[PDB]
Design a protein around this ligand. Sequence first.
Ligand SMILES: COC(=O)c1c(C)n[nH]c1-c1ccco1
Ligand SMILES: COC(=O)c1c(C)n[nH]c1-c1ccco1
Lengths: 208, 208
Amino acid sequence: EVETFAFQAEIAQLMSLIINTFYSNKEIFLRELISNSSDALDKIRYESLTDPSKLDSGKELHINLIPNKQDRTLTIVDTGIGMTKADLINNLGTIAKSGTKAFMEALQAGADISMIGQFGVGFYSAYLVAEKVTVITKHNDDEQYAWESSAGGSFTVRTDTGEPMGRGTKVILHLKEDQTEYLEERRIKEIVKKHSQFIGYPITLFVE
Amino acid sequence: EVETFAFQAEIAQLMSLIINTFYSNKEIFLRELISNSSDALDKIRYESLTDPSKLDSGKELHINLIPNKQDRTLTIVDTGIGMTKADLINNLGTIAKSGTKAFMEALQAGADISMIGQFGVGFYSAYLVAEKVTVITKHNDDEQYAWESSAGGSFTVRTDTGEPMGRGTKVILHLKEDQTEYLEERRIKEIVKKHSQFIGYPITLFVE
Ligand SMILES: COC(=O)c1c(C)n[nH]c1-c1ccco1
Ligand SMILES: COC(=O)c1c(C)n[nH]c1-c1ccco1
């Protein structure tokens, strides 16, 4: 069964700004999603120190970047803490409301889209490059879920029956037709080297 | 009763580097401690979304900066999640080991002390300016504790009987005699404005 939800007005407004504003420095989306993965990995690693069985769903803590020219997707996979259904439907949205409002205020005052990550809503920078984002995620206390949104003010969530991921989050960027440079090996390597050089987890860029 | 502990060799080595290296841009300590406070506040705010009673120990989420010329202290207080005794003695040290090692590697390779926060050990930048750091902290699942260290390879922890804080962390910087500019109103305001302008919690700078 697929459930369809309305984003809060403020988050929809943010997504439309990210989609509609002229802003050429789009490559920052990748830094933001890797940053999110690094935070999710810190969180599982911290929780494991007190409950080692939290890693029974997989010990390795890493980030993979997987381009696929045939599907026109760039996937960012981590083995971090994952997201529950409540995170997907409620918690992230309530955190995203006040971050959005601060970000909007900063932007009126001359801040730049590249600062989005300071307001805790850097995930939505995926819409610089993706016409659709699919997120597959699995938290230890919950089932594997697929969330998806092409913006336009709604998102879906369903229980995912695809390949079991163990634990973590996969963000699948369905790239806009003019953004396929982000499938290119040397372009991805360039961006990781520039913005993500000191991330404390191995980042493997897959080759096609 | 006061318990005295040895830092791991790697953390002691880091503290000695921070104390001994010539590095004039000391003001970054403040950005790092405010960043830590903002992360602790995000964590309590996130946990409250699923268990609202986590805020019974205080609803306001804020950061106060309190200079005291008579004591020569600058205190950074937050009402974030706080730290347990296990965090103080074990968990932070195990996180700090691999961050230290990456940071040391980056520094050999030409990275700068100001990047310390990327390796999750920005707390130790307090030793740029403080000859002693005292941290009073209170987590919902645990007692109020006072941790303290003047570096030299050891730290102490005791149960704190001072004024109850409700929930959060107070970092008290016993400033080096030549670092008292950090007690000055206009100097603190300058640094917050430069480095901490978009923190998503109210930061109140107390006046003397
Ligand atoms: C559907 O996924 C998300 O919304 C998401 C992921 C995968 N990481 N961070 C976020 C997020 C959303 C809002 C603030 O953070
Ligand atoms: C005694 O306090 C600490 O060590 C501390 C505080 C107060 N914030 N972050 C830290 C920390 C230490 C190591 C990595 O992070």
